[PDB]
Design a protein around this ligand. Structure first.
Ligand SMILES: [Ca+2]
Ligand SMILES: [Ca+2]
Ligand SMILES: [Ca+2]
Ligand SMILES: [Ca+2]
Lengths: 159, 159
C-alpha cells in the first residue's frame, strides 16, 4: 500500500561542491555547501518517481548561492546500489534534474528518473556565509512514499 | 569576548558504531547509530571546555540503546587537527568522557579534556529501530561558546 519508503539525512557542510573536506563554522564572505541524502528503502515495491528535495532557510542570514547552475550552485549524484553495493556516487546528467525553484532563501530540486530500491541521491547546495547561525530545513518526498521526511542542519557563521 | 565558536553537524545514520556504511531507512528490530560532530572554530581564542552534546527524542518510537557503555552504546572520537590537518578520528580514553545521562529517550555526553581550535569530536549513538519516523534533536555547547547549536536528524523506521 504505502509499500514504498524513503529516508533523508544531513551530511553537514563542506568547502567544495564535491570532494574537498568538511567545514562549519564558516567565516562570513566565504562559500560553503550543504549536502543531504535521499535514500530509497531496499524493500520498496519498485522504483520511486518525482523524488523531490525542498530546502528552506529557517534561521539566520546565509543564502543559497548563484542562479542555479548544475556543477557550480548545486550538484546531484546517484549511488545506484546505495550502501548495499560497491558502485560510487557519480553526478547525474543535467537532463535528469529539474530546478523547481532556486532563490537565496529556498531551493527545490526534482530527480526526473525513477529511483531504484536501495539507491541513494546526494544533493550539494552552494551558500554564501553571512552572519548569526544559519539553519535550513530539508524535506524529501516522492510520489509513492508517505513523505515528507524532514531534517534541520545548522551552520555557525563568524562575523 | 564571545571570541570562541563551536559548530554542530548531523552525519546521519550508520549500521555500525564506527566504520561500516550508511543506513536509513531501518527495519524495526534492528540496531542503528546516529553520528554527530561538534567542531571548534579554528579562530577560537584558545581551547574550549565542557564541550557537551545533548540528544533528545522529539518524534517517533526508536530508543537510544543499552545502559551507556563506551565502545558499544556510544563512541566519542577526536580528530585533533579537524579538517585542517591529516590526523584521523580516533576514540578517546574512557576517562575523557562523562555520561551525564543515558536513557532510551535522551542521552547527554560531556568531553572532559579541552578542545583545540580547529579540532572536531565525532559522537556515535546506538539506537533500537521501533516503528513511525524517529527524529532526534542534537544540541552542542561549551563554556566559552555562545551555544546551544541545534540540528534535527530523522530516521524512517519500517514496521
Ligand atoms: Ca536520516
Ligand atoms: Ca554504492
Ligand atoms: Ca552544521
Ligand atoms: Ca584531521
Amino acid at each position: 500500500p504505502t509499500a514504498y519508503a524513503l529516508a533523508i539525512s544531513s551530511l553537514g557542510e563542506f568547502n567544495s561542491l564535491t570532494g574537498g573536506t568538511s567545514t562549519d563554522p564558516v567565516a562570513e564572505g566565504n562559500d560553503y555547501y550543504y549536502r543531504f541524502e535521499i535514500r530509497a528503502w531496499e524493500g520498496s515495491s519498485g522504483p520511486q518517481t518525482n523524488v523531490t528535495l525542498n530546502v528552506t532557510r529557517t534561521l539566520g542570514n546565509s543564502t543559497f548561492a548563484g542562479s542555479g547552475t548544475k556543477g557550480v550552485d548545486f550538484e546531484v549524484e546517484l549511488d545506484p546500489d546505495g550502501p548495499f553495493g560497491p558502485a560510487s556516487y557519480a553526478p547525474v546528467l543535467s537532463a535528469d534534474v529539474q530546478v523547481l525553484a532556486w532563490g537565496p532563501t529556498g531551493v527545490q530540486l526534482r530527480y526526473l528518473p525513477s529511483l531504484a530500491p536501495g539507491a541513494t541521491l546526494r544533493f550539494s547546495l552552494r551558500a554564501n556565509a553571512v552572519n548569526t547561525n544559519t539553519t535550513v530545513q530539508a524535506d524529501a518526498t516522492s510520489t509513492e512514499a508517505p513523505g515528507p521526511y524532514t531534517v534541520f542542519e545548522t551552520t555557525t557563521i563568524i562575523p
